[PDB]
Amino acid sequence: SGLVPRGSHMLRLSAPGQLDDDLCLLGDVQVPVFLLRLGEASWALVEGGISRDAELVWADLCRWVADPSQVHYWLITHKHYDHCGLLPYLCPRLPNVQVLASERTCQAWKSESAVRVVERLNRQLLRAEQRLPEACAWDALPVRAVADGEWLELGPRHRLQVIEAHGHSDDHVVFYDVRRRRLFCGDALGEFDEAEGVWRPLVFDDMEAYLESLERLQRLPTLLQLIPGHGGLLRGRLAADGAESAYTECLRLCRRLLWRQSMGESLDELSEELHRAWGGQSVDFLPGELHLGSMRRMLEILSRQALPLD
Ligand SMILES: [Fe+3]
Ligand SMILES: [Fe+3]
């Protein structure tokens, strides 16, 4: 790497450890969990991860926090297997934690059907020799539902607003730190492309909603830090123009899809091409058959909802 030999300014922070005075990245940058120091004896976690990373995240958590009885909150953006998979495994080690999530997210953990999908996907990600810890029941998690527009006063230095951001999933929320101009955006802007510096759209429920969410997030004060559900912490113009860029990349995808369909292409064609182009990034946390499946689903949603070309 070049970066061995020069102290340049990094636009993306992608290593575990301290990101800012109040903020650490725990576990794996691929599916990170963030730690906020709220106080001398108080902490919050943000993003709920994949189950197989339990011990990775737990060891990093213990590097910074001598007493895990001091972790008081755990904010969750949405119900997908990769954003809540640690909860049953680490909540039992966090006796004072309250999970904060949307009503629709909380409802999913009460659904036998939903919880078993979450379990099925997370089991496929266990590494060689890994055994998960003892789990809590999903319906026994210490949860509180949070609402659109709600101010979460996590502590005297940390007040974060819950902003509804449906479209990626029907339950997706994001969390905005007004003081720090720092947005925890989950998968609402898509998947950040590490080779190209652009957003790949992740529209798995509703395109109109996904665009409207981005429209709304573009109106926040200019971001200084943008923290998606995968890949680390973005700063500079990548943060400041994140929501706008995410929006345009989604339009672009619609244009490609509707153009190729014009030429009589099947949806499966663009899907295999998107799986080929984009699937490599998430191979270590999303089974490849399921990335292609998700690509096809997104293209179905766009095909139905995109404004026609004539
Ligand atoms: Fe997701
Ligand atoms: Fe995700």
* Ligand 1 center from residue 84 Cα (angstroms): 10
CB 109 within 8 A of CB 84: yes
Ligand closest in space to the Cα of 202: 1
> How many domains does the structure of the chain reveal?
1
* Ligand 1 center from residue 39 Cα (angstroms): 30
Domain interval for residue 152: 1-310
Nearest to 118 by CA among 86, 75, 164: 86
CB 242 within 8 A of CB 199: yes
List, in sequence order, the alpha helices (H) in 263-287. Answer: 267-278
* Ligand 2 center from residue 121 Cα (angstroms): 12
Residue environment code for 75-107, b if the CB has 16+ CB neighbours within 10 A, otherwise e: bbbbbbbbbbbbbbbbbebbeebbbbbbebbbe
Ligand closest in space to the Cα of 79: 1
Q: Look up the CATH number of the domain holding residue 146.
A: 3.60.15.10
* Ligand 2 center from residue 174 Cα (angstroms): 13
* Ligand 2 center from residue 268 Cα (angstroms): 23
Position of tokens 């379990």?
119
* Ligand 1 center from residue 7 Cα (angstroms): 34
SS3 content of the chain, % helix, strand, coil (to 5): 40, 20, 40
User: Rounded to the nearest 5°, which phi and psi values hold at 103?
Assistant: -50, -45
For helices 288-305 and 267-278, give the axis angle rounded to 10 degrees: 130
* Ligand 2 center from residue 229 Cα (angstroms): 5
- For residue 34, give every residue at least 6 positions away whose Cβ sits within 8 Å of its Cβ, in sequence order, or none: 19, 23, 24, 25, 26, 45, 46, 47, 184, 227
Beta-carbon count within 10 A of 57 CB: 25
Ligand closest in space to the Cα of 78: 1
* Ligand 1 center from residue 71 Cα (angstroms): 24
* Ligand 2 center from residue 309 Cα (angstroms): 31
* Ligand 1 center from residue 229 Cα (angstroms): 8
Structure obtained using: X-ray
* Ligand 1 center from residue 50 Cα (angstroms): 12
Ligand closest in space to the Cα of 167: 1
Ligand closest in space to the Cα of 48: 2
CA dihedral 146, 165, 198, 20 (to 10 degrees): -20
Beta-carbon count within 10 A of 137 CB: 9
What's the rounded Cα separation, in Å, for the pair 70 and 35? Answer: 12
Position of tokens 């979460």?
152
* Ligand 2 center from residue 31 Cα (angstroms): 7
The token pair that represents 116 in the structure block = 């078993």
* Ligand 1 center from residue 155 Cα (angstroms): 28
Instruction: Report residues near ion ligand 1: CB below 5 Å.
Output: 80, 187
